[PDB]
Amino acid sequence: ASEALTMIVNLLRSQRPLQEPTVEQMRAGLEAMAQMSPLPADVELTTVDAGGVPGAWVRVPESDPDRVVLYLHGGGYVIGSIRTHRDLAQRIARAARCRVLLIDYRLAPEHPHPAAVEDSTRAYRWLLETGSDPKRMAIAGDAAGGGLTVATLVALRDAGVPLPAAAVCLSPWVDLEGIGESMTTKAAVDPMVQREPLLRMASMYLAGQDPRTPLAAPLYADLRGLPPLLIQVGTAETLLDDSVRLAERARAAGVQVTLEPWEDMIHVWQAFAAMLPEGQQAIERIGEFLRQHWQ
Ligand SMILES: COc1ccc2cc([C@H](C)C(=O)Oc3ccc(N(O)O)cc3)ccc2c1
Numbered sequence: 024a025s026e027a028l029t030m031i032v033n034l035l036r037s038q039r040p041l042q043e044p045t046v047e048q049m050r051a052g053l054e055a056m057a058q059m060s061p062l063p064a065d066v067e068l069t070t071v072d073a074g075g076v077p078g079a080w081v082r083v084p085e086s087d088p089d090r091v092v093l094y095l096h097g098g099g100y101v102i103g104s105i106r107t108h109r110d111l112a113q114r115i116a117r118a119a120r121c122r123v124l125l126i127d128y129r130l131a132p133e134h135p136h137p138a139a140v141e142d143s144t145r146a147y148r149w150l151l152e153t154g155s156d157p158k159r160m161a162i163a164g165d166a167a168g169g170g171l172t173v174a175t176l177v178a179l180r181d182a183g184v185p186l187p188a189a190a191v192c193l194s195p196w197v198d199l200e201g202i203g204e205s206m207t208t209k210a211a212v213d214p215m216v217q218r219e220p221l222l223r224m225a226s227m228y229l230a231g232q233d234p235r236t237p238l239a240a241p242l243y244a245d246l247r248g249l250p251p252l253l254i255q256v257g258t259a260e261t262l263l264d265d266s267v268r269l270a271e272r273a274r275a276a277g278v279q280v281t282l283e284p285w286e287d288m289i290h291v292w293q294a295f296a297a298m299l300p301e302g303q304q305a306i307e308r309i310g311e312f313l314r315q316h317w318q
Pocket of ligand 1: 053056057059060096097098099100103107108110165166167168196215216221224290291294295
């Protein structure tokens with residue numbers, strides 16, 4: 024992998040807190056990290072009320088308004104914001120030549136499961152209400168947001184709502200018990216994501232609910248009828264087998280799944296695309312995948 028990869032890994036390793044951070048710290052820490060990736064001048068951000076869910080359109084000059092990605096940010100269902108993921112959003116908007124709706128969905132522990140799913144489905148329904156065609160739509164998201172993407176599809180389907188053309192999951196989190204093999208074996212090679220912090224955020228999101236609640240942990244959801252699914256995952260991730268198990272399950276349910284394991288990549292490496300080549304390569308692929316399914 025690139026020298027940029029080894030640099031980011033060592034920097035993350037070196038700056039990892041020596042004790043468990045609070046929700047307040049993680050929130051403000053991610054917000055800070057996020058500000059090191061500045062927003063290019065041609066990016067257009069427009070705040071909007073997505074059917075009672077706050078959000079922002081992210082557009083670049085290339086964008087085709089008729090193509091829309093509903094983007095669901097990661098951060099354990101506990102952290103993240105429009106501002107933490109706007110860079111990733113604009114790269115996708117750029118690569119897929121689309122508009123991206125980045126929503127500030129409700130977060131745990133203030134708003135536990137299923138508040139997140141309530142918001143994502145509402146935002147999706149709002150998109151149809153305002154005239155977006157599912158044939159030119161997609162849902163995408165990273166990690167917790169990658170899990171939320173699957174959950175949202177399942178929920179919409181079960182509600183009889185027309186599903187989008189395609190969907191994309193980046194390092195998705197779908198096992199809230201962390202019993203995948205790579206949680207034990209790949210633990211350490213991932214500078215982020217350890218079991219203990221993971222399960223703590225699971226606890227907050229669940230607020231007592233069964234950790235295999237299907238819409239919370241979509242590894243246990245019924246995936247039949249889902250549209251073409253691109254899953255990008257790094258092979259140095261503790262969440263690798265979240266993607267492996269998701270692909271297995273989705274394909275057994277007749278979903279056209281594409282599992283893309285990027286060698287040596289770390290959790291949501293695409294977030295580092297500003298300086299990580301593979302990050303930008305992966306996003307270019309996202310755009311390619313989406314444009315294929317929109318024609
Ligand atoms: C430099 O610009 C950025 C901007 C945002 C970032 C966001 C993330 C964050 C951790 C992210 O969205 O990924 C997740 C999502 C969910 C979890 N679980 O399961 O708790 C763990 C990581 C990481 C680097 C980032 C870098």
